Design a protein around this nucleic acid. Structure first.
Lengths: 132, 101, 56, 221, 83, 217, 25, 71, 129
RNA sequence: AGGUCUCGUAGACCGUGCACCAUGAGCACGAAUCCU
RNA sequence: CAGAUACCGUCGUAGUUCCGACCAUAAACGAUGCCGACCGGCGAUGCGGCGGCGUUAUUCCCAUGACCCGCCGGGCAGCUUCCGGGAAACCAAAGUCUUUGGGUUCCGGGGGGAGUAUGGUUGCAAAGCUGAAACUUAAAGGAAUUUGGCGAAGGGCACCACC
């Protein structure tokens, strides 16, 4: 079997996190990059780290990874969490409401609002799944 | 020590139940204690159903099924791989194994 | 970086025993055990017998 | 050898903003640095080992023995504590028990037997503590009686500052750990009991975390 | 708490739970002390006053503490009486 | 909490309640929730009283603004319904957020890197977040929770009755909580609408994200 | 030995001693 | 106790007497059989003539014999 | 069956005191229960209570406060003299600074201090502290 | 008028007990704190 | 099978069935006496009663049956719980117990001898009830953890294992 240990995976993960722009999909190019940006005592460890960096690059090219915190794969998350629409989806010209909710709003503070319309209650009072 | 909340059976306010006989065995086991298994099967398996259907007078004929109820004693049921032992915290699970297939 | 001391002998009794004091970091296998740890074995001549020293 | 507090309570005590552990006990805050109490109570905090009890675990290659240490801590005019720690060696277990005992000490209160003259000397009421099968009762005594107990609750009551007590024990008292924890839980219950000496409406003073938050936000992040 | 001469011999006076009138112990870490802010009567802004309540750990672990805080706020006048 | 005339629930807030589906709850009823229920109806849906929800929201806002260090309020949401809402709440009021995977040992283990020791705690669900509730017991630390009609009440202090299942209602509670805290603190005027949009606190499935990206520019 | 067969052997000893006593009258 | 009535003293005394007789040390200390089987006859010391000497052996933990006489 | 109404009443009061309730519903009342509750009122352990008057046997609703530790009833009514009260003081009370013994004297239902003041003794009822 | 209705095909729960299978000589074990 | 007056297989007497007369014995176990009061929640279930939208015994009405949503009382039970208890397993009672007293019946004082001797009593008999002592012994037991070994179960491995 060929399963990478935790040292190779941690080294490749911090290499992907910390030096991301000067990388690529070629094994020899990021092999030389990992040769110069870090100190690896042996050569088999260098080749295994470079191979996992290539695999992680191919994985990043398809989507995000929950071990990696680079700059480029975020801030579209930030723009996605900060885009603001026009239509509120709560400021509606008509809103359906239940009759007991209408009577509850009658008692609370109001007599009549020009936004609500009332729907009929259900004629069947079945709501529970048959379990027994 | 006491192993179960019940006593390995389903008797709560009775004191006596009628006994039944095992099917793999001949032990006189009480009716609510014995592990019961209602199994339904076809007369033919999935391999011979095509051979029965190709040699049938009636086209689009429904194959009958076989209905039998099995009564097992405790040692007979655990030795025939019907029920096995489980963990102390998992012994209180009441739901059967899932009917995925 | 870390050390261990092993003293084996008839430590307070007729039957011998051994006490091991391990804390820190100590590698055991491979080529880097040759040039990272330093092993010395010594013998102590007391009035009751021989006591050994293993330090690394 | 220096103090680097990891909690804001320890930093606040080190910054001389908390006068004593009175308000710490009043606000019922947990103490997680054992040297806060060592700062508040210094040379007046004596200790001695109650019993070293060996425990063993059976493995494939014999028994792995371990030593468990019991130590009593406390000043002779107030607070008292108890700590249990087990390790491979004896000295490591004893020092860990010392740290764990000094980490968790409780205040005791003293009352009178009849008239309220002089300083308080005895247990104010009848308190009981139980753990395992052991029951320990503390009964008030007149002045000059002394402690009528087994030696381990006697030394715990002398290190707690109580001069007079009547006791009555029930259960397997041969186990020293359960007996010591039982009398510790008995003597710790002297403040959970409601007496008519304090029925007036208390006022809730401000917590140190509210009072010194401007100091805390500057001294630490 | 006192003697014949008149001074106090208890080293501290412990708190009592405002919902159950039980003494909060020194090692009872489940007990809380919540401060509730008082508001200005005209503008509606926090001025600097507090309303304090202490609940013991037994009431909090029983699950009947939120109605205790609601009742204390009703009796203090924080939560309106009609509710 | 709502006893004054300036602290009344206005016209638009009732419309936000009726459009976000706050007033209706789950099927089962917890016995601690008998007083925060108006009545029951057909198909097994309990009606949450909106005025008592307003009173509890004002009480929780008072408890939040009562302390003077805004970083000492810790807000935890571990379910996907309130991930971005508690982040926008912490960005608005200055609180400290936890969004998913609350590690068991922040409030108790003193040697961890994530050792947090706050003064007030806000959580969005008492049932799914059972881990901060029991961890809040070992220190003297109150807890404010957004509670449903079937959520169990244990180790909670201010229970705001709401529908914590839909993302719209949860975002609406976090937005009005930030609004009321900023109004009590004095940053936001009480009569001018500071309302930016309520949808900045709303969670949505990613399928709607590519749907909106395809339908928009 | 279980108590059942020790009780059976005890009852057999009762029968033997009773027979010997009643025949040694 | 079990009987807690105001007029329950004969029953308590009879039950305590029965449970006192149903004991061990009170049972040997109040019949005449345990003192009659005693060769001293309720005495601290006794005299007699030695007939012979016997070497009685020890139990299974230890290996020795005990020098003894018969009186 | 129901044989000691006062023991049942103090048992329900003690159970609801340990539970933490603020109001206790005693179903059967008696004059002895009224005097016991009046003594517990006058010594400041319980609050302001009621008598729910129906035409069979009244009910009593007691407003509770958190000052009560235990309420017990000694059964049966042992006769106690003035020289035998101190024995009960040491083996029934938790302390000498507080705690009271309710006993039935010929001058009325009262505590042990008023019994020593009026120089009389009677039968035991119970205790509270 | 079109002439293979639409979307992928766990579609193994063949089954039952299972030859004879006994015994083990004992000597060989000691429970712990702190620095000048 | 070394032996097999045992497990296994073929026969097979009393017995197994009913009537009439006997004994009063079970792990007759919820291994947990009876009456009464109090202390959390939830979903179902059997009976009786009460209330309410709807469907059906074919289209209208009423009552009865059958479904649905709830309440009340008694009963067999279930899930969860820092109520509380306990040596723990566990118990909503085995809780309300050194903060010890609601009323009442039976019964146990280390392990063997021993349910044995003797006496009385019941029965046709087998046997049932009552029930010792001498002597001997430093342990016998209850709950739970770790290892270990199962002709116990579930996953994998090894040419010092096999095919």
């Amino acid at each position: 079997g060929r399963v990478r240990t935790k040292t190779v995976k941690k080294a490749a993960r911090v290499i992907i996190e910390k030096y991301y722009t000067r990388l690529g999909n070629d094994f020899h190019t990021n092999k030389r990059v990992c040769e110069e940006i870090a100190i690896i005592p042996s050569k088999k460890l260098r080749n295994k780290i470079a191979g996992y960096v290539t695999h992680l690059m191919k994985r990043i090219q398809r989507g995000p990874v929950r071990g990696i915190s680079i700059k480029l794969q975020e801030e579209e998350r930030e723009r996605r969490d900060n885009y603001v629409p026009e239509v509120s989806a709560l400021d509606q010209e008509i809103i359906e409401v239940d009759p007991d909710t209408k009577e509850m709003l009658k008692l609370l503070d109001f007599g009549s609002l020009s936004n609500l319309q009332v729907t009929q209650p259900t004629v069947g009072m079945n709501f529970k799944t048959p379990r027994g | 020590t006491k192993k179960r909340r019940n006593n390995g059976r389903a008797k709560k306010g009775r004191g006596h139940v009628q006994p039944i006989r095992c099917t793999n065995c001949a032990r006189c086991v009480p009716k609510d204690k014995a592990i019961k298994k209602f199994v339904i099967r076809n007369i033919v398996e999935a391999a011979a159903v095509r051979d029965i259907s190709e040699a049938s007078v009636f086209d689009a004929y429904v194959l009958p099924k076989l209905y039998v109820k099995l009564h097992y004693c405790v040692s007979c049921a655990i030795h025939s791989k019907v029920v096995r032992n489980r963990s102390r915290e998992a012994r209180k699970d009441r739901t059967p194994p899932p009917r995925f297939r | 970086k870390g050390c261990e001391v092993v003293v084996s002998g008839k430590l307070r009794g007729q039957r011998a025993k051994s006490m091991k004091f391990v804390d820190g970091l100590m590698i055991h296998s491979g080529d880097p055990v040759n040039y990272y740890v330093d092993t010395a074995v010594r013998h102590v001549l007391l009035r009751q017998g021989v006591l050994g020293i293993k330090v690394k | 050898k220096e103090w680097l507090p990891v909690t804001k309570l320890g930093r606040l005590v080190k910054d001389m903003k908390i006068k004593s552990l009175e308000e710490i006990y009043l606000f019922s805050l947990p103490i997680k640095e054992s040297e806060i109490i060592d700062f508040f109570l210094g040379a007046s905090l004596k200790d001695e080992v109650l019993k070293i009890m060996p425990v063993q675990k059976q493995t494939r290659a014999g028994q792995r023995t371990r030593f468990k240490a019991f130590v009593a801590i406390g000043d002779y005019n107030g607070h008292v504590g108890l700590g249990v720690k087990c390790s491979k060696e004896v000295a490591t277990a004893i020092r860990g028990a010392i740290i764990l005992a000094k980490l968790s000490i409780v205040p005791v209160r003293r009352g009178y037997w009849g008239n309220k003259i002089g300083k308080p000397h005895t247990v104010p009421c009848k308190v009981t503590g139980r753990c395992g099968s052991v029951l320990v009762r503390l009964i008030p005594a007149p002045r000059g009686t002394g402690i009528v107990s087994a030696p381990v609750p006697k030394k715990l009551l002398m290190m707690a500052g109580i001069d007079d007590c009547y006791t009555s024990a029930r259960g397997c008292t041969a186990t020293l750990g359960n007996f010591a924890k039982a009398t510790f839980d008995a003597i710790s219950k002297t403040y959970s009991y409601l007496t008519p000496d304090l029925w007036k409406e208390t006022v809730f003073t401000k917590s140190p975390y509210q009072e010194f938050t401007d100091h805390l936000v500057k001294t630490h992040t | 708490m006192q003697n014949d001469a008149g001074e106090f011999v208890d080293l501290y006076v412990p708190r009592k739970c405002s919902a159950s009138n039980r003494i909060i112990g020194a090692k009872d870490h489940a007990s809380i002390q919540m401060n509730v802010a008082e508001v200005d009567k005209v503008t509606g802004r926090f001025n600097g006053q507090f309303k304090t309540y202490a609940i013991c750990g037994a009431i909090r672990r029983m699950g009947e503490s939120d109605d205790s805080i609601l009742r204390l706020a009703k009796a203090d006048g924080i939560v309106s009486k009609n509710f | 909490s709502g006893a004054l005339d300036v602290l009344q629930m206005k016209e638009e807030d009732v419309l936000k309640f009726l459009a976000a589906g706050t007033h209706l709850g789950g099927t089962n009823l917890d016995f601690q929730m008998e007083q925060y229920i108006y009545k029951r109806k057909s198909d097994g849906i309990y009606i949450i009283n909106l005025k008592r929800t307003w009173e509890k929201l004002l009480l929780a806002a008072r408890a939040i603004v009562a302390i003077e260090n805004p970083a000492d309020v810790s807000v935890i949401s571990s379910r996907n319904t309130g991930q971005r809402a508690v982040l926008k709440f912490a960005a608005a009021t200055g609180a400290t957020p936890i969004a998913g995977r609350f590690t068991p040992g922040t409030f108790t283990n003193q040697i961890q890197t994530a050792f947090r020791e706050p003064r007030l705690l806000v959580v969005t669900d008492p049932r799914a977040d059972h881990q901060p509730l029991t961890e809040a017991s070992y220190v003297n630390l109150p807890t404010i929770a957004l509670c449903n009609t079937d959520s169990p009440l244990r180790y909670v202090d201010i229970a705001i009755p709401c529908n914590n299942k839909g993302a719209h209602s949860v975002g609406l509670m976090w937005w009005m909580l930030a609004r009321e805290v900023l109004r009590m603190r004095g940053t936001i005027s009480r009569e001018h609408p500071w309302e930016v949009m309520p949808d900045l606190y709303f969670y949505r499935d990613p399928e709607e994200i590519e749907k909106e990206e395809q339908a928009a520019a | 030995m279980r108590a059942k067969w020790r009780k059976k052997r005890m009852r057999r000893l009762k029968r033997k001693r009773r027979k010997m006593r009643q025949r040694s009258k | 106790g079990k009987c807690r009535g105001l007029r329950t003293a004969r029953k308590l005394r009879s039950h305590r007497r029965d449970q006192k007789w149903h004991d061990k040390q009170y049972k040997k200390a109040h019949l005449g059989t345990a003192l009659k089987a005693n060769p001293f006859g309720g005495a601290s010391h006794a005299k007699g003539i030695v007939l012979e000497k016997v070497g009685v052996e020890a139990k299974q933990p230890n290996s020795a014999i005990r020098k003894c006489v018969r009186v | 069956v129901r044989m000691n109404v006062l023991a049942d009443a103090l048992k329900s009061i003690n159970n609801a005191e340990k539970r933490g309730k603020r109001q206790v519903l005693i179903r059967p009342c008696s004059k002895v229960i009224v005097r016991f509750l009046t003594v517990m009122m006058k010594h400041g352990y319980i609050g302001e209570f009621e008598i729910i008057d129906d035409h069979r046997a009244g009910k009593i609703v007691v407003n509770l406060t958190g000052r009560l530790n235990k309420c017990g009833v000694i059964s049966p009514r042992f006769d106690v003299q003035l020289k035998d009260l101190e024995k009960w003081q040491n083996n029934l009370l938790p302390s000498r600074q507080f705690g009271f013994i309710v006993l039935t004297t010929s001058a009325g239902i009262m505590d042990h201090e008023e019994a020593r003041r009026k120089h009389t003794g009677g039968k035991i009822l119970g205790f509270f502290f």
